[PDB]
From a paper:
In M. capsulatus (Bath), two related β-sheet proteins (31% sequence identity) have been previously identified, a cytochrome P460 (McP460) and a cytochrome c′ (McCP-β)5,6 encoded by the CytL and CytS genes respectively. Cytochromes P460, defined by an unusual porphyrin-Lys cross link at the 13′ meso carbon, catalyse the oxidation of hydroxylamine (NH2OH) to form N2O under anaerobic conditions. In contrast, cyts cp-β (the only known cytochromes c′ with a β-sheet fold) lack this crosslink and appears to be optimized for binding non-polar molecules (including NO and CO) without enzymatic conversion. High resolution crystal structures reveal a highly similar tertiary structure between the two proteins but major structural differences around the heme pocket consistent with a switch of function between hydroxylamine oxidation (P460) and NO binding/sequestration (cyt cp-β).
Author numbering:
A (entry chain B), B (entry chain A): 3 to 138
Amino acid sequence: TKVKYPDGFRSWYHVKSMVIQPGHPLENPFGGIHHVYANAEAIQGLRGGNYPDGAVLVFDLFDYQEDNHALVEGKRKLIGVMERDAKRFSATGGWGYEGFGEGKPDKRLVTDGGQGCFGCHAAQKESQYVFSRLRD
Amino acid sequence: TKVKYPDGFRSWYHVKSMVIQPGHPLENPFGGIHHVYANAEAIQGLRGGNYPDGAVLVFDLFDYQEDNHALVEGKRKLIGVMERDAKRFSATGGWGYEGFGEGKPDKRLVTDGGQGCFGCHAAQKESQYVFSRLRD
Ligand code: HEC
Ligand code: HEC
Ligand SMILES: [Zn+2]
Ligand SMILES: [Zn+2]
């Protein structure tokens, strides 16, 4: 019933990126520069298919340093992970939600079976609980 | 003698990202959110191996918009492209330099054989004229 650590996600397709600066509603704990990655199965859902079991999306969050009006990536803060399994994760709309502190497999962040994550993602039910959209 | 448009570069490994904001010395013309991509041959050279002819690095530059203490990706401004051919691009350190406006294959930007690009990259001779470093 645990989300698997998504080994090798850095080699996956880069969906998009966004900077969340101090003052943003999501600052705690998602402040920083994040990159969204999708495995092959998740790309099927992002393209307008149904997300297959085994789809994984990763929210890869870095600290940044503002230096002379450049925002420069610092250390990895955490990753967020969504793992599709319609049966195993039925209580949170078919996605398992986990966080890994500093992107380390032994630093699991979710302590409520992913209900809090799901509570916010639920608004995106019509896009299968996923915020990020494919871009060129 | 022309640098090839790097078709399918959006499927390549994402090396790193950076934001260049107003008041930074590179704001014209590199202001925005940029993502660096590397093909297989470029990964060999980055990882600390040497760069094979055929290595390609892409600088993918987006305008961004301010949205309530987030910086959100906007339209693509341009791509920069370095293609390795030690013999063909010998006049610019063995990399061919090209810009494509809005990332469109039909909007080539470089008019001086890439000597302007190379002038800045020459400072990075000890890393084979590449600024970007691999990160986790
Ligand atoms: C200094 C005034 C520069 C000039 C002129 C050009 N580039 Fe460059 N480039 C510069 C920097 C500081 C960086 C690193 C950005 C980062 O995120 O660390 C880059 C990077 C590239 C890359 C990616 C590979 C690398 O060397 O890191 C490419 C593909 C690239 N630049 C291409 C490019 C082209 C085609 C230029 C002339 C049109 C050009 N650059 C000029 C700094 C400078
Ligand atoms: C209060 C709102 C909110 C909460 C709580 C939340 N997120 Fe999300 N999450 C977002 C938003 C907004 C995005 C889209 C970011 C973007 O567009 O770059 C996002 C994106 C993601 C993504 C990339 C896929 C997508 O849907 O775009 C993953 C993976 C993710 N979140 C995981 C988590 C996990 C794991 C938790 C709990 C540990 C969680 N999130 C909590 C708002 C939330
Ligand atoms: Zn405010
Ligand atoms: Zn600033």
